[PDB]
Structure 1
Amino acid sequence: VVEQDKLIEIRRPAVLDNVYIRPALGKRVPGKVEIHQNGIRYQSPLSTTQRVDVLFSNIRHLFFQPCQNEMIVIIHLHLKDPILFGKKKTKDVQFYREAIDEFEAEQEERRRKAELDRLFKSFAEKIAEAGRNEGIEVDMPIRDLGFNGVPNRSNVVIYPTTECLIQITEPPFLVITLEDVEWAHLERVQFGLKNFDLVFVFKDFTRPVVHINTIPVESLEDVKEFLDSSDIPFSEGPLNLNWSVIMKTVTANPHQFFLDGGWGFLQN
């Protein structure tokens, strides 16, 4: 673990109350995030041992995700370097809250959503403002550019952001920083396809590739437009390739790999 400076305490700190943390520490408990001098602190009055400090200097990305009718509002921190987290470690920490006469009932559901969205949005801007000489901006998922896919087991929506491609609605969290990407390869694209798979190769060849599987064919051209828009070069093929073999070969002699034309072998 990379060493982190002590949090410097701040008058009363800006606060977001009644908030849960993911990944979860003991039992899941409601908590409280406070903005301080050089970072933020999470803690709960119901688990009085717990404390999670994150410095502005260790925040690579800050995301605000309003209720996209998954009945959850999220503020997400993608960290530069992982930090100790109970007896484990994490590179992502997020704070969330879930939603908990028909005319007036819907009035109230609407009010509750707007309330949570306002509280979380406001706090997110306060974090960016307080950590602004570290250059922090609030980034947000782009709803109309989202597409379905399976990066783990369950079908989830993956959203492009200004700098990233994320899935933070449910664990395991995915935050791909686009500038880290070397190449993308589209698998099982063939006449009559129902869905296809997307593979990300990173500029660091020791980093494992990321599979986003089972993307509906309705989203095939949209993903390509996304890749082009992100200046990520790509290829496509009918087969699922063995990336263990490929990345093993590449990491052994990357200089010869690029003298041989690099990822062009994926392009016929």
Structure 2
Amino acid sequence: DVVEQDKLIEIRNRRPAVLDNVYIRPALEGKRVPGKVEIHQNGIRYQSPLSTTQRVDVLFSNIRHLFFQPCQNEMIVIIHLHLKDPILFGKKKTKDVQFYREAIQEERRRKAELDRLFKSFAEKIAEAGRNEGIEVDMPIRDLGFNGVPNRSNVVIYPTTECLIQITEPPFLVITLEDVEWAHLERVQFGLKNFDLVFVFKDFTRPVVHINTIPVESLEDVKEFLDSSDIPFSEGPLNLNWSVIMKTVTANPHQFFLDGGWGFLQNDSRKESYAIYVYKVLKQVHPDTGISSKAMSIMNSFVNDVFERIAGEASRLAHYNKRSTITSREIQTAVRLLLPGELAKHAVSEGTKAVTKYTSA
């Protein structure tokens, strides 16, 4: 389902301002051929020449951002529309709609003429949508950095209001005002790259990862977050965000009483158990929080003990000619590695959990 849009109100008195020979993304059903965009009173219209029904109406009222990206240093030139509420798009729905034309010394004039054309049109759209507070936003190229939102390496560009990747799908548009917190992960001596995680003010919205950003962009990324007034934290580990957000969305007040996003990791292959340590804390001391340095120490205990028990189970399995580690090797390892009273209760709890698990 979607949010209903009013009908487009057409300009008929005159031939409307038109941008010809453009492709649309996402693509529609059928052959890939050029269409055109027309500007009207309440919005704009993409139109395919395959059938008068193959078209897309977009209201000024439903455009959150209007981006223009020149091809001065790219293969294609683009006008991109990011929408407040998504729209039905043939079978699917989309929150983005973009129009592009490919560019293929002598190319100098063709490329620059292509940009002047799209830029003017983009301006006409904003002028046409002046009532709705629409403005042409553009990438800030000198602040660009590389990263992997999906599967391939791409350049992420800040804009006046956003952080974007619109050159190839899947598209990335992060509106900074929506952000609650940023987290930099795998930041440690001597990293080659790190991961950037965006948390949103809407705690039900999934977090956004921009992975594998080169270390040479670490300082520029921080500077960008600071200048965008986005608070952040950083550390060596990857956190378990889907579990974290669920824990937070439940009871956010207690979460922020307990220290907020910072205590999960802030130290500036090891596993983060931090969110689970916190879950247990909320069982044993519901009103007591834990600092980031203390959480880091607890997390190291857990890794250490994991590694020690597993290392011994592996040892036991080999000595006993078994090829598989089971609960029996864990139990024996626990018996050998832990002090008696502590080992007694641990063996009891591990046995109790298997008993419950297996009854089910």
Q: Deviations over 1:164-216 (max 9, x none)?
A: 00000000001000000000000000001000000000000000000000000
The number of residues matched between the two structures is 261
Q: Is the 8 A contact 1:30 1:46 kept in 2?
A: no
SS at match of 1:120: helix
Q: Deviations over 1:87-132 (max 9, x none)?
A: 11000000001111xxxxxx32111101110110000000000001
Q: Is the 8 A contact 2:38 2:46 kept in 1?
A: yes
Q: Is the 8 A contact 1:64 1:75 kept in 2?
A: yes
Aligned to 1:244: 242
Q: Distance in 2 between matches of 1:44 and 1:251?
A: 44
Q: Distance in 2 between matches of 1:27 and 1:141?
A: 31
SS at match of 1:172: coil
The worse-fitting range, judged by mean Cα deviation, of 258-267 and 113-122 is: 258-267
Q: Structure 1 length as normaliser, TM-score? A: 0.95
In the TM superposition, what is the alpha-carbon distance from 1:266 to its structure 2 partner? Answer: 3.8
In the TM superposition, what is the alpha-carbon distance from 1:68 to its structure 2 partner? Answer: 4.5
Name the % identity: 100
Q: Distance in 2 between matches of 1:84 and 1:92?
A: 11
Aligned to 2:166: 168
Q: Which runs of 4+ in 1 moved over 4 A?
A: none
Q: Is the 8 A contact 2:72 2:112 kept in 1?
A: no
In the TM superposition, what is the alpha-carbon distance from 1:27 to its structure 2 partner? Answer: 2.2
Q: Deviations over 1:42-65 (max 9, x none)?
A: 002134431100000000000000
Q: Deviations over 1:214-250 (max 9, x none)?
A: 0000000000000001000000010111111111111
Q: Distance in 1 between matches of 2:215 and 2:82?
A: 30
Q: Distance in 2 between matches of 1:173 and 1:253?
A: 32
Among residues 202, 205, 211, which one is paired with 2:203 in the alignment?
A: 205
Q: Deviations over 1:61-99 (max 9, x none)?
A: 000000152211000000000011001100000000111
Larger Cα-atom Rg: 2
Q: Distance in 1 between matches of 2:240 and 2:208?
A: 13
Among residues 95, 98, 103, which one is paired with 2:99 in the alignment?
A: 95
Aligned to 1:264: 262
Q: Distance in 2 between matches of 1:147 and 1:46?
A: 39
Q: Distance in 2 between matches of 1:84 and 1:212?
A: 28
Which structure has more strand as a fraction of its residues? 1
Among residues 4, 15, 22, which one is paired with 1:12 in the alignment?
A: 15
Q: Distance in 2 between matches of 1:5 and 1:171?
A: 28
Structure 1: gaps (5+ residues)? 101-106
Q: Is the 8 A contact 2:85 2:95 kept in 1?
A: yes
Q: Distance in 2 between matches of 1:167 and 1:74?
A: 12
Q: Is the 8 A contact 1:193 1:217 kept in 2?
A: yes
Q: Is the 8 A contact 2:149 2:211 kept in 1?
A: yes
Q: Distance in 2 between matches of 1:161 and 1:260?
A: 34
Note the 1:1-268 alignment, pairs <5 A.
1-10=2-11, 11-25=14-28, 26-100=30-104, 107-266=105-264
